[PDB]
């Protein structure tokens, strides 16, 4: 039964439901794809390129198996990198990556082999012959992707998005406004950034107003490219009321290597968030908040590869509710907000929070949590406290095209398995199941973000 | 089959168990019913009155579905309020309310239709014709409710409880001593309250001793009406050792609009809790503690409807163990205490706490948590750490009569499903399962509170 | 329906093949609370009570939770009376792992397939009495196929019986494990007496940090020489930061003179000692086990009466794990094999992601209140979805009683095999790798990690 028809499906009801939704087009509110690569439409050369070269999950697991970096991010050939992953792939059994990579192979290349030393070479060769006919745009069309949203920096000119709107066929590729750098006054680089922003937008950014003026122009810049959302990464959401003169003072201090106090950083951040909210009210943008990623926990990884290189963890010790309280009461009914949490242990907080504010939505299982297990828990749980029906929608969070489909498949099977179970336990009539499941997989998120 | 016989049952064993307990009478340690309504024995007029008019859960989800307040707590006719709920009811699929309301329809009115715009009018008309023969006392008798306990304020006269003991034929309706207002010195009307209390009990309440004297008379007042329990709502249980002079100082400060320090509030609360424990020792009352409800989180709801209007949430950031420690060691073996937790994430704390103090009991899944999902997790989990057998007992927490039976059904099915499973995996012989299940559904709780 | 039979805990066919694959693998037990002297003396037990309840604080708890006075728990009533009370009340244990463990021992070891209750009490006591003679530790160690054990030992210990066990016990390797908690706990009443004992046995001026360290290192070398390969550490709130030796020295000297030390002093002292235990372990390549989250002696009456490990320790969800481990972890990144255990399952995600980012870190088995078919199913499925089930540190018995070993080991392997079975049948894992995964986790993996 490996990756077969009833993969992840445990009841008959689940199977009708999945059959009802499997061919719905993919709507992807958030991913880490680059538009330039779609516009250039260049094939891939290797399964390594496609599957491991830019997947930090793969790097992690690979390191967790005792495979030196030579073959992870280092200077060994793709083919060698590939052979090592396969050598060790059977130890990944149980973890979503094991399933995703195989799903790509079976659904995209139609190579139904199981990965291991024994199979490594035959798979490498079979994929090499097939990779050429494969292009992003061909893949986008094959996987029925209707809309994508990438994550972009306020400073970006959105050039490729422009070109994609022009020439890319049946996909809508929207940018998403992520102003985290702007917000992070603790980051070395903040100043260079604040300096770049004034440059690109024509503003005295060494002043808060000028920087805000620059952020607003950035936001308008994004509006004009069909953008409908802001993504925000926060460890401990701490939003309270922050005076402009204090904000102004801190902002100016920041331009002069002052080690700012925690209060200064916090005040600065609380303030910037309220301003992102104001900006987004004026455009009716969905405000996504990704809470709880402790980043660059692992020093050696930071100093060597830097961010997003495999050393971020979650922590359970976070004041969520009292930290969002001001923001949420402030934009109550005025702003669509979607909440994500990295520690599933915090679902209840966000879930109850969403139960009490019609403008707030619970996101899909986020990072370490997007796994059949996490999806089962996240959904069953969320269904019993708010409404499954308002789930913001599946998010690929993917760095690689092939994932899209397989990621989308996994999600829909699990969601359809979850509802199936409830249908068979007699909690949900089949009719409304069929409707619930369709809404969540497509109509709902489409309506919400677009 | 929706809401059929094996609703919530997943194994044969479960079915024997459920059949064993389905006809046991209902014992309801805690609910938010009014005795006056039971004594007056007035029929309801509408399914709206019966199902939505006073159910804040229904208010929540309706708001979560985008239905304006006009049709929630506003000025639209019951019939319009009803039609809106049904219009949108299919989006509730997955949430316990969807099941509860249908269960009432099927078990009480014998209307086996599924709620939707298509069905709205036919249901409304069928229920209107049947609602007359329906009364509280007839319903109490029908649903086999043997004992209820409402929640009452220390100031109450318990008049209708008196009347109900006199005239209500096969139900025992007991009041429950909830002294939260007395405890909450941060609340606006604390003073007015402290003033009322001395008035009804004849004490100079602007003095701690006089207030205490007043609370004790209240407690004796309750004793005389067959009361056997105190309910306490606490966000962050913080009980330590508080001097009467300090307590006395704070109490007097509180009578003169002093913005008291957090330490003053805390000390005053710590002190009041210990004195509630003392009072309960002398009467051997069960002390219920409901931990973790962040209330009136949503401002607009507070300013508009006020409390219990749909804006309370849970939060995971609570120091439970070290906050209960003083209390618990203090009343170790001297007081029956039941713990409830709003965030399921905190079960392990309370569960291990209960595992170490024979006077401490773990309550049923509490608020956002009473849902087939919540019950399954709460129970399996609790069973593996302490003893399912000492579970305090199912609690309806309901504001509406009809719920009682359906609430009681759901619970017993799930409980019986959970033990069924363990019987089928060979962890529990069927004989002790039958015993376990019967004890938990009736005998245990009845013995524990009565 | 069938209780404690062949498919006990098994919910799918795949699970059954997997379990049959591993049920006969020998037991490797990285951590337990056994005493080597009892193994060396090889003395039979007298009663089921002795064997099952006399020294099992879980049984003490549940009995107290059933309303049975201490007379019959740790008090002065005869074993037989203690036993009869336990049975009287045993049916109320239904659902809790102890109910299943004790029965498993009866059925797998004594072959007494009866179910425990008042009705059965006397017939079980009499059947076990006749069988208990032929039963010995060493006979049991051989019967239950235990290849390796590791006890928990205090740095002051002379490891005498471990010596004798190496010599005369054939078939089993009984290793000591270095637990320096007392040394670390400067808040404890007898810390000083301890610090004094340590210098005595190791010949050092312990009123001094260097001397105490010198003493700890000698203890560590003392353990090395008895084939020890691990240190166990119990911490509530791991708070490891950077602590200067002069401050450490200052605090240590203060501690020798009844000074109520400040929380910072205690914390500093602990942070410092942990980094030093890490250093000592680097030099020997010892596995560093950290058991996080036990609030102990929470219940006073139990403390004043029986003291520690008597049934009054609880878990708490309010712990800063990640930022507390951060210095340690970044400090020994790639240099030290660390295994993490968490007492509140709600903290798994932290340790699990932590382990996902450091190849030298391993997630332990479900620990205390969590080792239960329920805890194991959750712990495992969960861990599988975030790091690799395949690197699980390995099952740990944690047991204070021999008979448990096998039953403990059985429960675990069934559940592990039930969990993997499920994923095999949902089509997430080919059967070949499942067979491999399951065998690795049950034996080869844990063996190579600790040994």
From Swiss-Prot, chains A, B:
GO MF annotations in UniProt: glucuronate isomerase activity
Class of the enzyme per the UniProt entry, highest EC level: isomerase
Protein's pathway: Carbohydrate metabolism; pentose and glucuronate interconversion
Gene3D superfamilies, alphabetized: Metal-dependent hydrolases (3.20.20.140), uronate isomerase, domain 2, chain A (1.10.2020.10)
Isomerase recorded as keyword: yes
HAMAP family: UxaC
Family: Belongs to the metallo-dependent hydrolases superfamily. Uronate isomerase family.
Subunit structure: Homotrimer.
Name of this protein: Uronate isomerase
Organism: Thermotoga maritima (strain ATCC 43589 / DSM 3109 / JCM 10099 / NBRC 100826 / MSB8)
Gene coding for it: uxaC
């Amino acid at each position: 039964m490996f990756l077969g028809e009833d993969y992840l499906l445990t009841n008959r009801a689940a199977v009708r439901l999945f059959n009802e939704v499997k061919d719905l087009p993919i709507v992807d509110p958030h991913n880490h794809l680059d538009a330039k690569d779609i516009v250039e439409n260049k094939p891939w050369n290797d399964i390594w390129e496609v599957e491991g070269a830019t997947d930090h999950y793969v790097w992690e697991l690979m390191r967790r198996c005792g495979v030196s970096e030579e073959y992870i991010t280092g200077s060994r050939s793709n083919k060698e990198k590939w052979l090592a992953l396969a050598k060790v792939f059977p130890r990944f059994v149980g973890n979503p990556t094991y399933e995703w990579i195989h799903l790509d192979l079976w659904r995209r290349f139609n190579i139904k082999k199981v990965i291991s030393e024994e199979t490594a070479e035959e798979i490498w060769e079979e994929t090499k012959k097939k990779l050429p006919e494969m292009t992003p745009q061909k893949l986008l069309r094959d996987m029925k992707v209707e809309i994508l949203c990438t994550t972009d920096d306020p400073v970006s000119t959105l050039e490729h998005h422009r070109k994609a709107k022009e020439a890319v066929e049946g996909v809508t590729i929207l940018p998403t406004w992520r102003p985290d750098r702007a917000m992070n006054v603790d980051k070395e680089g903040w100043r260079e950034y604040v300096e770049k922003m004034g440059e690109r937008y024509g503003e005295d950014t060494s002043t808060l107003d000028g920087f805000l003026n620059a952020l607003w122009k950035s936001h308008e810049h994004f509006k004009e490219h069909g953008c409908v959302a802001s993504d925000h990464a926060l460890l401990e959401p701490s939003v309270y009321y922050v005076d402009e003169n204090r904000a102004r003072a801190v902002h100016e201090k920041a331009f002069s290597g002052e080690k700012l106090t925690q209060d200064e950083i916090n005040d600065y951040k609380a303030f910037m968030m309220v301003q992102f909210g104001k900006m987004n009210q004026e455009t009716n943008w969905v405000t996504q908040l990704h809470i709880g990623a402790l980043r660059d926990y692992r020093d050696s990884l930071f100093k060597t590869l830097g961010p997003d290189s495999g050393g971020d963890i979650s922590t359970n010790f976070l004041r969520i509710a009292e930290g969002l309280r001001y923001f949420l009461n402030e934009f109550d009914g005025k702003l669509k907000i979607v909440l994500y949490v990295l520690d599933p242990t915090h679902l209840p907080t966000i879930s109850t929070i969403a139960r009490a504010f019609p403008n707030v939505y619970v996101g899909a299982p986020w990072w370490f949590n997007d796994s059949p297990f996490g999806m089962e828990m996240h959904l069953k749980y969320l269904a019993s406290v708010d409404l499954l029906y308002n789930l913001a929608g599946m998010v690929t969070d993917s760095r690689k095209l092939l994932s899209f489909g397989s990621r989308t498949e996994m999600f829909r099977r699990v969601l359809s398995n979850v509802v199936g179970e409830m249908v068979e336990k007699g909690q949900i009539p089949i009719k409304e199941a069929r409707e619930l499941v369709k809404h969540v997989s497509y109509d709902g998120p489409k309506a919400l973000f677009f």
